[PDB]
Every structure is written in C-alpha cells, then in structure tokens.
C-alpha cells in the first residue's frame, strides 16, 4: 500500500517503486524491485531501459573546470524491459493494478558497495553535496549510447542504508602505559543516533609529573578513497574538564558525551546520512563491512572512535558504531513536520 511514483515532465514513462530504501546486508542486498509504466504509443519504434548509477559527486560548485565532471560511477547496471527471475509479490500487484502495460525491472547490487553518505555543505560550497548518490534512471533508447534528455526520463533517486545488527558487538577497550597507566572503556558497542555515550576514565598515574587538564574527544573518520586512501579527522563532540589526579593516586569518572548536529553546523568535513533533497539529516551512520577488507572498497567509509588525552600526552582510541535500529514501518526520509 502507498507505493512511490515519480512522473517525468512529459505525460509518459512514470516509474513505480515499492520503497525508496534498500537495507544493505553483509552478504546480499535487497533487490531493487519496481515497475516502469509506459503509454502504448511512444514505444512502438523504441524500447525501455532502466539504469542504476552509484554516483560519487565530489566537486565543489558543481562546475567542470577542465572537463572534471566529478561524476565517478562505482556501479552501473542495465536491463531491458520491452524486448528472467520470477517476480516478487509486490511486482505482481503493480502489474495487476496498473495493467498489461506495466513492464517490470529488477536490479541486483553486488556486495561491498559503499552506503549513501554525503558531506556537509558548510561555508560556501554552493550547489550539490559531496558523497555517494544512488539513482534510478529510466529512459527509452534503442542504442544504449544515444544521448537522452532529462525531460524524456525519470531521475528518481534512491538511498541505500545500513542498520544496526541484532547481536551487540564486543565491549571496546584500550590502554597506554608510555608517558602513566591508562584504561578506558565504553558501556556498549551498539549506539543509536542521539543516545548518550558513557566512557570510563579510570586511570592510575605513577610518574612525578601531574596532569593539568583532561579532554575526551569524539571524531568521525571519513575514509574517503577514490584515487588514494584518506583518514580525515573531524571532531563531532568535545568534553574538556579541569579534573586532576595527584601523583601515585587514582581517578575514575563517568564523563558522558552526546554527538548531535546542533553545534556542528559550521564544521567542514563532517559526513551526514544520505540526503534525497536539500533537507537536513543526522550524522552519517557507521558503515560496517565483512572480513577480508573488501580489497579496496572504493567509496566513503565512516567510522567513529572516542579518545581520552592528558595535558601535562598519552592517549588511547576506542572504536564504536553509531547506527539506527531496524525501522518498524518505513523512514519517510524527510523532516516529518517540515516547513
């Protein structure tokens, strides 16, 4: 009930999709079902094609200075619907309701593709965002290469996301002895968006030097890899405390932090969740991948770590995941009480 349809500006070639969301499982993703509808005319001398592109828009001001389109494609698929596997339950309902001129199309995304993650349009940076943008492009063509116009096509956009696993992960911990014995831990590995993060800072100094200030920092690693690997640091929450521990003594505290977008609207390099239009979403969900490192895994990979530092500077880093739970009904993918 309540399928999503997008109609091209001319009165023909609309596209029906069951849901504008496709969870990315570790092994196999959900196939991109849907039915492209076309009027009886306008096709007798052509055929319909559906093309899915995993774009990598990464250019500011969306201007091609020297032919730099920035339109790097990570995966492209083609299907002919008006010349396979049996149709799922949803596709049969669309065929029955729409009529006999309801040509189905089905996609099968391979594993270890990056999820839909964008970067925050901070100062300047006018135009579109910087990140992976999946899209479904339905058009009529008979050569696979003839230039098609945006008017005679549907540029429906989809988003591929990943949700937190049911089984909680192992509790993270780290230590560092070099100058001072340090021990840190988190409450639980699985963290939902907006939930507080509690850390343990139980420490036992031994050196004559005494700590002056303590800082707990959370940063969001944007491991963007298109031509070379990157390990960008962008802080997302900070906690500076004046607490001090005397030499040959111990200090334990339960300082808590909470990452949110209210105070990070000006920072650059921050990665947000997948966006379909100019609305604002939350921080980018942590992306998890299977073993073997997936070779290079070209795309944007978001990982979260929390660190504790001493100012006198031994520091430790504790990874964790920041992911949404499995939704009950459906994500509307927009500010529900908008405007």
């Amino acid at each position, epitope marked *: 009930t309540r399928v999503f349809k997008k109609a091209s500006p001319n009165g023909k070639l609309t596209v029906y999709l069951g849901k504008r969301d496709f969870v990315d499982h570790i092994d196999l993703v959900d196939p991109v079902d849907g039915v492209v509808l076309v009027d009886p005319e306008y096709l007798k001398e052509r055929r319909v094609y559906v093309t899915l592109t995993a774009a990598f828009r990464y250019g500011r001001e969306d201007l091609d200075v020297l032919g730099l389109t920035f339109r790097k494609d990570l995966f492209v698929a083609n299907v002919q619907s008006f010349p396979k596997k049996p149709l799922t339950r949803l596709q049969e309902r669309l065929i029955k309701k729409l009529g006999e001129h309801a040509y189905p199309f089905t996609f099968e995304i391979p594993p270890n593709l990056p999820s839909s993650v964008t970067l925050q349009p901070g100062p300047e940076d006018t135009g579109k965002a910087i990140g992976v943008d999946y899209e479904v492009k339905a058009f009529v063509a008979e050569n696979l290469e003839e230039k098609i116009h945006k008017r005679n096509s549907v540029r429906l956009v989809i988003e591929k996301v990943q949700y937190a696993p049911e089984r909680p992960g192992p509790q993270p911990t780290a230590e560092t002895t070099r100058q001072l014995h340090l021990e840190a831990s988190l409450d639980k590995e699985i963290y939902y968006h907006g939930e507080p993060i509690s850390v343990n800072v139980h420490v036992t100094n031994n050196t004559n030097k005494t700590v002056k200030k303590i800082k707990i920092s959370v940063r969001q690693y944007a491991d963007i890899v298109l031509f070379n690997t990157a390990q960008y640091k962008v802080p997302v929450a900070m906690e500076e405390a004046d607490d001090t521990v005397a030499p040959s003594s111990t200090f334990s505290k339960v300082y808590t932090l909470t990452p949110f977008l209210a*105070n990070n609207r000006e920072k650059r390099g921050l990665a947000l969740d997948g966006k379909l239009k100019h609305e604002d979403t939350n921080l980018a969900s942590s992306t998890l991948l299977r073993e073997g490192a997936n070779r290079e895994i070209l795309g944007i990979i978001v990982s979260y770590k929390v660190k504790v530092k001493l100012v006198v500077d031994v520091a430790v880093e504790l990874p964790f995941t920041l992911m949404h739970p499995k939704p*009950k009904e459906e994500p509307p993918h927009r500010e529900v009480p908008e405007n």
Partner: single-chain antibody, 222 residues
Framework: DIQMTQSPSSLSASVGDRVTITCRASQSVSSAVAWYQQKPGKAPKLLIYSASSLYSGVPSRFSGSRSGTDFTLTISSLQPEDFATYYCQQYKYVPVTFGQGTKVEVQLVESGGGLVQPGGSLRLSCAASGFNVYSSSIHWVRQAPGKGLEWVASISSYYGYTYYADSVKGRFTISADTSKNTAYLQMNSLRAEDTAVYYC?????????????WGQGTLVTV
C-alpha cells in the same frame, strides 16, 4: 493551514458493537495521522501512529485505514473501559492540528499553575525522566476547558530547532536544559483566552511517530 474535521461529534453505542469514527483532512496529507484517546481528566494516549500501524500496548481490536483523505478508526467491540473522546491528528506540517473530538458513550511531571491575572508570567517546568533530550523532541500542547487539543510550541534539541504556533509567536518561549533533562516554557503577555491545561508531550526525535508520552496537567487561569 490545514483544518481537521471529524463528522460524528457525539456517538452512542452499547458493549459489543462495531463502531466507525471517521476523520477527513482539509488537505491531502500522507499516512502521517495519529489517533488519541483521552479519558475525562486524564492525558491523551496514543493509539495508532501511522493511520495503519497499531501502537505497541493497545489492544489489537483497534484498527485504522486510509483512503484519499478519509482516515478512520474502528473498534470491533466496545469494552466498558472505552467511553472517551477520540482526536484525529496530523503531523505532516509544523502547525499540527487535532480534531474536534468524538465523544463515545518513563514519566513526565510538570510544575506550575495558579492565578496570574492578565499581564503576568509563569515558567512551566517539565521534569522528564527515562529518555534523552537529544534523542527525543519536546512539544507543548494546551487544552482549553471543553475544547479540543491545541499545539503551542516545540523544540528539537538534536537539530537546534524551535517552532511556535501563530497565536503564541513572540509572546511564548521554549527552552530545554540537557544536564537537568527538563523542558521549560516561559510565557509573557498572558491574555484572556490562554486559560488551559498544559501538557508536556514527548515524541521520538528520529522519525516522528506521534506524541508517545504526555504529561499530567498544570492548568493555568488568568
């Protein structure tokens, strides 16, 4: 804006009857409709949070459906603990609107109230426990005596956004303190028709699904 209507204003039935409560929206909103049941003198309780999805906890006999803009709620059998007022509410746009009410025949605690007379100022505290301010959204909804629910103001701490109704813009201010985990509503220039019972409602910030939890009541008389 959107003006929300319910065709039956007063319904009378007996135990063991299938009744239909209809609701029509002025504009073509999506499936974003919530249904609330208010016992007399008690805070309303959410029943259906997407016009088709049953809230966790309410009996399975309650059901809802949509067609164009004809959101309806049906009860298979009226148990004796069902005679109350039902409100039809949409949350697709910032001025959320409630129905006129159909008569059938984690804790939040506020603080405040008392006679103030016109021109005064009160600060309503909403001591919220059990949920994080950043992971939830706080709304303030008042109820004039004998009338339907009305939306006043809301705050979303995660996004740093505040929304106010057209009738309380500027005069009313909303704030929330994270460390104390409370929501404060300070009112200025209190006029004649602000006499109402004020409820501190809390909804889930990420993917709003109706006002899950309500307050108790700190009625203010001017």
């Amino acid at each position: 804006d959107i003006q929300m209507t319910q065709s039956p204003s007063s319904l009378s039935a007996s135990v063991g009857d299938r009744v239909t409560i209809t609701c029509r929206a002025s504009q073509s909103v999506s499936s974003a409709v919530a249904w609330y049941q208010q016992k007399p003198g008690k805070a309303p309780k959410l029943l259906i949070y997407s016009a088709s999805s049953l809230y966790s906890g309410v009996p399975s006999r309650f059901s809802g459906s949509r067609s164009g803009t004809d959101f309806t709620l049906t009860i298979s059998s009226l148990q004796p603990e069902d005679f109350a007022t039902y409100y039809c509410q949409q949350y697709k746009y910032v001025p959320v609107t409630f129905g006129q009410g159909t008569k059938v025949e984690v804790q939040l605690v506020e603080s405040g109230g008392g006679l103030v007379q016109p021109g005064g100022s009160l600060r309503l505290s909403c001591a919220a426990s059990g949920f994080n301010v950043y992971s939830s959204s706080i709304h303030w909804v008042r109820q004039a005596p004998g009338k339907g629910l009305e939306w006043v103001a809301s705050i979303s701490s995660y996004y740093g956004y505040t929304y106010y109704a057209d009738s309380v813009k500027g005069r009313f201010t909303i704030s929330a303190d994270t460390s104390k985990n409370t929501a404060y509503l300070q009112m200025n220039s209190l006029r004649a028709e602000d006499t109402a019972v004020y409820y501190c409602a809390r909804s889930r910030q990420f993917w709003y699904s109706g006002l899950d939890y309500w307050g108790q009541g700190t009625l203010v008389t001017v």
